[PDB]
Amino acid sequence: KKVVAVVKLQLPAGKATPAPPVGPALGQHGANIMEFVAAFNAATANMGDAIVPVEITIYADRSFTFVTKTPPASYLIRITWEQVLEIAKQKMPDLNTTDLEAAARMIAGSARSMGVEVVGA
Amino acid sequence: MWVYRLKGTLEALDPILPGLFDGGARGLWEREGEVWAFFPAPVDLPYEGVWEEVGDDWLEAWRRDLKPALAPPFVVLAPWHTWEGAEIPLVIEPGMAFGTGHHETTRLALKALARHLRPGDKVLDLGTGSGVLAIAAEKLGGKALGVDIDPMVLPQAEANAKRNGVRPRFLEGSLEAALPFGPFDLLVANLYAELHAALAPRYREALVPGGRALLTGILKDRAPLVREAMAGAGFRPLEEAAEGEWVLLAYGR
Numbered sequence: 001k002k003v004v005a006v007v008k009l010q011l012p013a014g015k016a017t018p019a020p021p022v023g024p025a026l027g028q029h030g031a032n033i034m035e036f037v038a039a040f041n042a043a044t045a046n047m048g049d050a051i052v053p054v055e056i057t058i059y060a061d062r063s064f065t066f067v068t069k070t071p072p073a074s075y076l077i078r079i080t081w082e083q084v085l086e087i088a089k090q091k092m093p094d095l096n097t098t099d100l101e102a103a104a105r106m107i108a109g110s111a112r113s114m115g116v117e118v119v120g121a
Numbered sequence: 122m123w124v125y126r127l128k129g130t131l132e133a134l135d136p137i138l139p140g141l142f143d144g145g146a147r148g149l150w151e152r153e154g155e156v157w158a159f160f161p162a163p164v165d166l167p168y169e170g171v172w173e174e175v176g177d178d179w180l181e182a183w184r185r186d187l188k189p190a191l192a193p194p195f196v197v198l199a200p201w202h203t204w205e206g207a208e209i210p211l212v213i214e215p216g217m218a219f220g221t222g223h224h225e226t227t228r229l230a231l232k233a234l235a236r237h238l239r240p241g242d243k244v245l246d247l248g249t250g251s252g253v254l255a256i257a258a259e260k261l262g263g264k265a266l267g268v269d270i271d272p273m274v275l276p277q278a279e280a281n282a283k284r285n286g287v288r289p290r291f292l293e294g295s296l297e298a299a300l301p302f303g304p305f306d307l308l309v310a311n312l313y314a315e316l317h318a319a320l321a322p323r324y325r326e327a328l329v330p331g332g333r334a335l336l337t338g339i340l341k342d343r344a345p346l347v348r349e350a351m352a353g354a355g356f357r358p359l360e361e362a363a364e365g366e367w368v369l370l371a372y373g374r
Protein backbone atom coordinates (compact mmCIF):
# COMPACT_ATOMS: atom_id res chain seq x y z
CA LYS A 1 0.00 0.00 0.00
CA LYS A 2 2.09 2.92 -1.39
CA VAL A 3 1.18 6.31 0.04
CA VAL A 4 0.72 9.28 -2.23
CA ALA A 5 -0.82 11.69 0.19
CA VAL A 6 -1.82 12.22 3.82
CA VAL A 7 -4.44 14.98 4.08
CA LYS A 8 -4.99 16.82 7.35
CA LEU A 9 -8.55 18.14 7.42
CA GLN A 10 -10.61 19.37 10.35
CA LEU A 11 -14.41 18.83 10.13
CA PRO A 12 -17.75 19.20 11.98
CA ALA A 13 -19.13 15.84 13.08
CA GLY A 14 -21.83 14.37 10.72
CA LYS A 15 -21.39 17.41 8.47
CA ALA A 16 -18.79 16.25 5.87
CA THR A 17 -19.90 17.19 2.27
CA PRO A 18 -18.34 16.84 -1.16
CA ALA A 19 -17.78 20.65 -1.18
CA PRO A 20 -14.46 22.10 -0.09
CA PRO A 21 -12.41 21.15 1.74
CA VAL A 22 -13.24 17.46 1.12
CA GLY A 23 -13.90 17.76 -2.63
CA PRO A 24 -10.56 19.16 -3.67
CA ALA A 25 -8.41 17.73 -0.85
CA LEU A 26 -9.20 14.10 -1.76
CA GLY A 27 -10.49 14.77 -5.24
CA GLN A 28 -7.05 15.81 -6.40
CA HIS A 29 -5.75 12.22 -5.55
CA GLY A 30 -8.77 10.73 -7.15
CA ALA A 31 -10.11 9.17 -3.92
CA ASN A 32 -13.82 8.48 -3.73
CA ILE A 33 -14.94 11.58 -1.86
CA MET A 34 -18.36 10.12 -1.54
CA GLU A 35 -17.17 7.03 0.28
CA PHE A 36 -15.26 9.35 2.58
CA VAL A 37 -18.27 11.63 3.27
CA ALA A 38 -20.48 8.65 4.09
CA ALA A 39 -17.72 6.87 6.07
CA PHE A 40 -16.68 10.03 7.95
CA ASN A 41 -20.23 10.96 8.71
CA ALA A 42 -21.09 7.44 9.94
CA ALA A 43 -18.07 7.27 12.36
CA THR A 44 -19.05 10.71 13.70
CA ALA A 45 -22.90 10.81 13.37
CA ASN A 46 -22.17 10.29 17.10
CA MET A 47 -20.09 13.08 18.58
CA GLY A 48 -22.93 15.66 18.13
CA ASP A 49 -21.70 19.19 17.38
CA ALA A 50 -17.90 18.72 17.64
CA ILE A 51 -14.97 19.48 15.49
CA VAL A 52 -13.05 16.48 14.38
CA PRO A 53 -9.46 16.48 13.21
CA VAL A 54 -9.21 13.70 10.60
CA GLU A 55 -6.11 12.43 8.68
CA ILE A 56 -6.82 10.81 5.31
CA THR A 57 -4.12 8.50 4.03
CA ILE A 58 -4.57 8.16 0.20
CA TYR A 59 -2.86 5.27 -1.53
CA ALA A 60 -1.38 4.76 -5.02
CA ASP A 61 -4.51 2.94 -6.30
CA ARG A 62 -6.96 5.76 -5.27
CA SER A 63 -8.15 3.86 -2.13
CA PHE A 64 -7.74 5.68 1.21
CA THR A 65 -7.85 5.30 4.95
CA PHE A 66 -8.79 7.74 7.75
CA VAL A 67 -8.24 8.18 11.43
CA THR A 68 -10.20 10.64 13.54
CA LYS A 69 -8.58 12.27 16.61
CA THR A 70 -10.42 13.44 19.71
CA PRO A 71 -11.77 17.12 19.66
CA PRO A 72 -10.65 20.19 21.69
CA ALA A 73 -10.84 20.79 25.40
CA SER A 74 -13.44 23.47 24.66
CA TYR A 75 -16.43 21.52 23.29
CA LEU A 76 -15.26 18.55 25.43
CA ILE A 77 -16.48 20.29 28.55
CA ARG A 78 -20.18 21.03 28.06
CA ILE A 79 -20.16 24.82 35.10
CA THR A 80 -18.10 22.19 37.00
CA TRP A 81 -16.01 21.50 40.14
CA GLU A 82 -13.35 18.76 39.89
CA GLN A 83 -14.81 16.17 37.50
CA VAL A 84 -12.05 17.40 35.09
CA LEU A 85 -10.42 14.57 36.99
CA GLU A 86 -13.06 12.77 34.94
CA ILE A 87 -12.27 14.54 31.63
CA ALA A 88 -8.53 14.51 32.42
CA LYS A 89 -8.69 10.71 32.09
CA GLN A 90 -11.02 11.17 29.11
CA LYS A 91 -8.39 13.61 27.81
CA MET A 92 -5.24 11.44 27.77
CA PRO A 93 -5.91 8.98 25.02
CA ASP A 94 -6.80 12.61 24.12
CA LEU A 95 -3.61 14.57 24.89
CA ASN A 96 0.20 14.67 24.79
CA THR A 97 1.85 14.77 28.26
CA THR A 98 0.86 11.64 30.23
CA ASP A 99 1.63 13.84 33.23
CA LEU A 100 -1.96 12.89 34.04
CA GLU A 101 -1.75 15.84 36.48
CA ALA A 102 0.12 18.00 33.92
CA ALA A 103 -3.09 17.98 31.93
CA ALA A 104 -5.58 18.53 34.76
CA ARG A 105 -4.12 22.01 35.57
CA MET A 106 -3.86 22.93 31.87
CA ILE A 107 -7.36 21.74 30.88
CA ALA A 108 -8.74 23.19 34.15
CA GLY A 109 -6.99 26.56 33.93
CA SER A 110 -8.50 26.52 30.46
CA ALA A 111 -11.73 24.95 31.66
CA ARG A 112 -12.06 27.89 33.99
CA SER A 113 -11.73 30.95 31.75
CA MET A 114 -14.34 29.14 29.63
CA GLY A 115 -15.40 29.53 32.22
CA VAL A 116 -16.96 26.63 34.08
CA GLU A 117 -15.84 26.91 37.70
CA VAL A 118 -13.27 25.36 40.11
CA VAL A 119 -13.15 23.00 43.11
CA GLY A 120 -10.10 20.83 42.15
CA ALA A 121 -6.74 19.88 43.73
CA MET B 122 -17.05 29.11 -1.99
CA TRP B 123 -14.58 31.52 -0.20
CA VAL B 124 -11.34 30.67 1.56
CA TYR B 125 -9.75 32.35 4.57
CA ARG B 126 -6.03 31.71 4.26
CA LEU B 127 -4.01 31.64 7.50
CA LYS B 128 -0.35 31.21 7.94
CA GLY B 129 0.69 28.20 10.06
CA THR B 130 -0.20 24.59 10.77
CA LEU B 131 -3.36 23.41 12.51
CA GLU B 132 -1.37 22.73 15.69
CA ALA B 133 0.25 26.17 15.69
CA LEU B 134 -3.17 27.85 15.04
CA ASP B 135 -4.99 25.57 17.50
CA PRO B 136 -5.96 28.35 19.98
CA ILE B 137 -8.04 30.19 17.31
CA LEU B 138 -9.49 27.19 15.35
CA PRO B 139 -12.85 27.15 17.24
CA GLY B 140 -13.13 30.90 16.56
CA LEU B 141 -13.02 30.22 12.79
CA PHE B 142 -15.98 27.85 13.14
CA ASP B 143 -17.96 30.11 15.41
CA GLY B 144 -17.35 32.52 12.51
CA GLY B 145 -19.20 30.14 10.13
CA ALA B 146 -16.44 27.93 8.64
CA ARG B 147 -17.45 24.57 7.18
CA GLY B 148 -14.06 22.89 7.23
CA LEU B 149 -10.34 23.26 7.78
CA TRP B 150 -7.67 22.01 5.31
CA GLU B 151 -4.01 22.03 6.32
CA ARG B 152 -1.94 23.03 3.31
CA GLU B 153 1.80 23.83 2.79
CA GLY B 154 2.33 26.47 5.59
CA GLU B 155 -1.32 27.61 5.82
CA VAL B 156 -4.69 26.54 7.09
CA TRP B 157 -7.45 27.05 4.54
CA ALA B 158 -10.85 27.66 6.05
CA PHE B 159 -13.84 27.38 3.82
CA PHE B 160 -16.81 29.74 4.14
CA PRO B 161 -19.90 30.53 2.07
CA ALA B 162 -19.16 34.25 1.88
CA PRO B 163 -16.49 36.53 3.38
CA VAL B 164 -17.21 37.72 6.93
CA ASP B 165 -14.38 39.96 8.36
CA LEU B 166 -12.27 38.15 10.83
CA PRO B 167 -9.98 39.25 13.55
CA TYR B 168 -7.42 36.57 12.76
CA GLU B 169 -4.89 38.28 10.52
CA GLY B 170 -5.81 35.95 7.65
CA VAL B 171 -6.56 36.83 3.96
CA TRP B 172 -9.62 35.97 1.72
CA GLU B 173 -9.79 34.41 -1.78
CA GLU B 174 -12.90 33.37 -3.68
CA VAL B 175 -12.39 29.96 -5.29
CA GLY B 176 -13.57 28.35 -8.62
CA ASP B 177 -16.93 26.40 -8.65
CA ASP B 178 -19.00 19.22 -9.13
CA TRP B 179 -15.99 17.72 -7.41
CA LEU B 180 -18.24 14.62 -7.59
CA GLU B 181 -18.23 14.57 -11.38
CA ALA B 182 -14.56 15.34 -11.42
CA TRP B 183 -12.91 12.33 -9.72
CA ARG B 184 -15.59 9.96 -11.31
CA ARG B 185 -15.28 11.42 -14.83
CA ASP B 186 -11.46 10.71 -15.17
CA LEU B 187 -11.62 7.23 -13.64
CA LYS B 188 -11.90 4.58 -16.30
CA PRO B 189 -12.41 0.78 -16.50
CA ALA B 190 -9.04 -0.87 -15.58
CA LEU B 191 -8.23 -3.37 -18.30
CA ALA B 192 -6.32 -6.50 -17.16
CA PRO B 193 -7.12 -9.24 -19.64
CA PRO B 194 -9.21 -11.34 -19.42
CA PHE B 195 -10.68 -9.11 -16.76
CA VAL B 196 -11.84 -5.52 -16.62
CA VAL B 197 -12.20 -3.80 -13.22
CA LEU B 198 -15.28 -1.57 -13.32
CA ALA B 199 -16.75 0.88 -10.82
CA PRO B 200 -20.52 0.42 -10.34
CA TRP B 201 -21.38 3.15 -12.82
CA HIS B 202 -19.13 1.97 -15.60
CA THR B 203 -20.42 0.28 -18.68
CA TRP B 204 -18.55 -2.23 -20.76
CA GLU B 205 -19.24 -3.77 -24.11
CA GLY B 206 -16.21 -6.12 -24.55
CA ALA B 207 -16.06 -9.89 -23.77
CA GLU B 208 -13.77 -9.38 -20.67
CA ILE B 209 -14.90 -10.91 -17.36
CA PRO B 210 -16.10 -7.89 -15.34
CA LEU B 211 -14.92 -7.48 -11.82
CA VAL B 212 -17.15 -4.73 -10.26
CA ILE B 213 -15.20 -2.93 -7.50
CA GLU B 214 -16.03 0.60 -6.26
CA PRO B 215 -12.92 2.60 -5.33
CA GLY B 216 -13.36 2.54 -1.57
CA MET B 217 -11.32 2.08 1.63
CA ALA B 218 -9.35 -1.05 0.71
CA PHE B 219 -6.44 -1.42 -1.68
CA GLY B 220 -7.28 -3.45 -4.80
CA THR B 221 -9.44 -1.09 -6.81
CA GLY B 222 -7.55 -2.38 -9.86
CA HIS B 223 -5.84 0.90 -10.57
CA HIS B 224 -2.46 -0.27 -9.66
CA GLU B 225 0.17 -2.28 -11.56
CA THR B 226 0.45 -5.05 -8.95
CA THR B 227 -3.24 -5.75 -8.75
CA ARG B 228 -3.43 -5.95 -12.54
CA LEU B 229 -0.33 -8.16 -12.90
CA ALA B 230 -1.85 -10.50 -10.30
CA LEU B 231 -5.14 -10.67 -12.22
CA LYS B 232 -3.38 -11.47 -15.47
CA ALA B 233 -1.29 -14.12 -13.70
CA LEU B 234 -4.34 -15.84 -12.28
CA ALA B 235 -5.63 -16.36 -15.79
CA ARG B 236 -2.39 -18.07 -16.80
CA HIS B 237 -2.13 -20.32 -13.76
CA LEU B 238 -5.53 -21.08 -12.18
CA ARG B 239 -6.88 -24.53 -13.37
CA PRO B 240 -10.58 -24.99 -12.90
CA GLY B 241 -11.26 -26.38 -9.42
CA ASP B 242 -8.05 -25.08 -7.85
CA LYS B 243 -8.07 -24.01 -4.23
CA VAL B 244 -6.67 -20.47 -4.14
CA LEU B 245 -5.21 -18.58 -1.25
CA ASP B 246 -5.22 -14.82 -1.77
CA LEU B 247 -2.91 -13.63 0.91
CA GLY B 248 -3.43 -9.90 1.67
CA THR B 249 -6.90 -9.73 0.16
CA GLY B 250 -7.67 -6.01 0.68
CA SER B 251 -10.69 -5.23 -1.49
CA GLY B 252 -11.00 -8.99 -2.25
CA VAL B 253 -10.62 -8.33 -5.98
CA LEU B 254 -8.22 -11.35 -6.63
CA ALA B 255 -10.25 -13.85 -4.60
CA ILE B 256 -13.27 -12.69 -6.63
CA ALA B 257 -11.28 -13.09 -9.84
CA ALA B 258 -10.33 -16.64 -8.78
CA GLU B 259 -14.01 -17.60 -8.23
CA LYS B 260 -14.84 -16.11 -11.63
CA LEU B 261 -12.23 -18.44 -13.02
CA GLY B 262 -13.80 -21.41 -11.25
CA GLY B 263 -11.33 -21.67 -8.40
CA LYS B 264 -12.39 -22.04 -4.65
CA ALA B 265 -10.83 -18.95 -2.94
CA LEU B 266 -9.82 -17.81 0.53
CA GLY B 267 -8.91 -14.18 1.17
CA VAL B 268 -7.04 -13.44 4.36
CA ASP B 269 -5.94 -10.01 5.72
CA ILE B 270 -4.32 -9.04 9.01
CA ASP B 271 -6.34 -5.80 8.86
CA PRO B 272 -9.95 -6.50 9.95
CA MET B 273 -11.29 -3.30 8.41
CA VAL B 274 -11.03 -4.46 4.80
CA LEU B 275 -12.97 -7.70 5.34
CA PRO B 276 -16.58 -6.38 5.35
CA GLN B 277 -15.50 -4.46 2.23
CA ALA B 278 -14.29 -7.62 0.61
CA GLU B 279 -17.53 -9.34 1.42
CA ALA B 280 -19.48 -6.53 -0.12
CA ASN B 281 -17.36 -6.58 -3.31
CA ALA B 282 -17.90 -10.31 -3.44
CA LYS B 283 -21.67 -10.02 -3.05
CA ARG B 284 -21.94 -7.46 -5.89
CA ASN B 285 -19.99 -9.78 -8.18
CA GLY B 286 -22.16 -12.90 -7.49
CA VAL B 287 -19.46 -15.19 -6.02
CA ARG B 288 -18.72 -16.39 -2.41
CA PRO B 289 -14.93 -16.95 -1.46
CA ARG B 290 -14.15 -17.33 2.39
CA PHE B 291 -12.57 -14.16 3.98
CA LEU B 292 -10.94 -14.26 7.36
CA GLU B 293 -8.67 -12.22 9.58
CA GLY B 294 -4.99 -13.25 9.90
CA SER B 295 -2.14 -14.35 7.65
CA LEU B 296 -0.64 -17.53 6.28
CA GLU B 297 -0.97 -19.15 9.74
CA ALA B 298 -4.68 -18.52 9.88
CA ALA B 299 -5.12 -19.86 6.29
CA LEU B 300 -3.32 -23.16 6.88
CA PRO B 301 -6.21 -25.20 8.28
CA PHE B 302 -8.17 -24.21 5.17
CA GLY B 303 -5.50 -25.62 2.85
CA PRO B 304 -3.21 -26.82 1.51
CA PHE B 305 -3.78 -24.81 -1.66
CA ASP B 306 -3.14 -25.31 -5.30
CA LEU B 307 -2.43 -21.72 -6.01
CA LEU B 308 -1.34 -18.86 -3.86
CA VAL B 309 -1.46 -15.25 -4.99
CA ALA B 310 0.12 -12.59 -2.79
CA ASN B 311 0.12 -8.95 -3.73
CA LEU B 312 2.29 -7.72 -0.86
CA TYR B 313 5.94 -6.51 -0.89
CA ALA B 314 9.51 -7.87 -1.43
CA GLU B 315 10.62 -8.26 2.22
CA LEU B 316 7.38 -9.88 3.46
CA HIS B 317 7.58 -12.59 0.75
CA ALA B 318 11.21 -13.18 1.54
CA ALA B 319 10.25 -13.74 5.19
CA LEU B 320 7.27 -16.00 4.23
CA ALA B 321 9.04 -18.07 1.52
CA PRO B 322 9.54 -21.32 3.58
CA ARG B 323 5.91 -21.16 4.58
CA TYR B 324 4.59 -20.47 1.12
CA ARG B 325 6.01 -23.92 0.51
CA GLU B 326 4.22 -25.34 3.52
CA ALA B 327 0.87 -23.97 2.21
CA LEU B 328 1.01 -25.47 -1.29
CA VAL B 329 0.42 -29.00 -2.45
CA PRO B 330 3.28 -30.48 -4.59
CA GLY B 331 2.69 -29.05 -8.08
CA GLY B 332 1.08 -25.79 -6.94
CA ARG B 333 2.07 -22.20 -7.83
CA ALA B 334 2.84 -19.06 -5.94
CA LEU B 335 2.27 -15.88 -7.84
CA LEU B 336 4.09 -13.12 -5.94
CA THR B 337 3.75 -9.44 -6.58
CA GLY B 338 3.75 -6.09 -4.80
CA ILE B 339 7.45 -6.27 -5.54
CA LEU B 340 9.51 -3.22 -6.58
CA LYS B 341 11.81 -4.10 -9.52
CA ASP B 342 15.05 -3.46 -7.54
CA ARG B 343 13.89 -5.40 -4.51
CA ALA B 344 13.27 -8.47 -6.71
CA PRO B 345 16.48 -10.36 -5.94
CA LEU B 346 15.41 -10.62 -2.23
CA VAL B 347 12.57 -12.66 -3.49
CA ARG B 348 14.34 -14.65 -6.18
CA GLU B 349 16.77 -15.62 -3.37
CA ALA B 350 14.25 -16.56 -0.64
CA MET B 351 12.13 -18.61 -3.02
CA ALA B 352 15.18 -20.43 -4.28
CA GLY B 353 16.02 -21.16 -0.64
CA ALA B 354 12.57 -22.54 -0.04
CA GLY B 355 12.83 -25.01 -2.92
CA PHE B 356 10.61 -23.29 -5.43
CA ARG B 357 11.41 -23.58 -9.11
CA PRO B 358 10.89 -20.33 -11.16
CA LEU B 359 8.32 -19.74 -13.94
CA GLU B 360 7.66 -16.52 -15.82
CA GLU B 361 8.24 -12.97 -14.49
CA ALA B 362 5.99 -10.18 -15.53
CA ALA B 363 6.41 -6.37 -15.05
CA GLU B 364 4.51 -3.08 -15.34
CA GLY B 365 6.04 0.29 -14.47
CA GLU B 366 8.34 -0.39 -11.53
CA TRP B 367 6.67 -3.64 -10.38
CA VAL B 368 7.24 -7.32 -11.03
CA LEU B 369 5.23 -10.42 -10.51
CA LEU B 370 7.38 -13.48 -9.93
CA ALA B 371 5.69 -16.88 -10.54
CA TYR B 372 7.05 -20.09 -8.93
CA GLY B 373 6.15 -23.78 -9.09
CA ARG B 374 6.63 -26.00 -6.13
Ligand SMILES: Nc1ncnc2c1ncn2[C@@H]1O[C@H](CSCC[C@H](N)C(=O)O)[C@@H](O)[C@H]1O
Nearest residue numbers: 219220227248249250269270271294295311
Ligand atom coordinates in the same frame (compact mmCIF):
# COMPACT_ATOMS: atom_id res chain seq x y z
N1 LIG C 1 1.31 -10.09 6.81
C1 LIG C 1 0.15 -9.96 6.18
N2 LIG C 1 -0.74 -11.02 6.12
C2 LIG C 1 -1.92 -10.82 5.46
N3 LIG C 1 -2.27 -9.61 4.92
C3 LIG C 1 -1.39 -8.61 4.94
C4 LIG C 1 -0.18 -8.75 5.58
N4 LIG C 1 0.46 -7.58 5.49
C5 LIG C 1 -0.32 -6.71 4.79
N5 LIG C 1 -1.47 -7.34 4.49
C6 LIG C 1 -2.58 -6.85 3.72
O1 LIG C 1 -2.12 -6.99 2.42
C7 LIG C 1 -2.75 -6.09 1.56
C8 LIG C 1 -1.81 -5.68 0.39
S1 LIG C 1 -2.72 -4.51 -0.67
C9 LIG C 1 -3.04 -5.89 -1.86
C10 LIG C 1 -4.58 -6.00 -2.00
C11 LIG C 1 -5.16 -6.85 -3.10
N6 LIG C 1 -4.94 -8.30 -2.81
C12 LIG C 1 -4.61 -6.45 -4.50
O2 LIG C 1 -4.02 -7.29 -5.18
O3 LIG C 1 -4.80 -5.35 -5.06
C13 LIG C 1 -3.29 -5.03 2.48
O4 LIG C 1 -4.73 -4.99 2.49
C14 LIG C 1 -2.75 -5.39 3.84
O5 LIG C 1 -3.74 -5.23 4.82
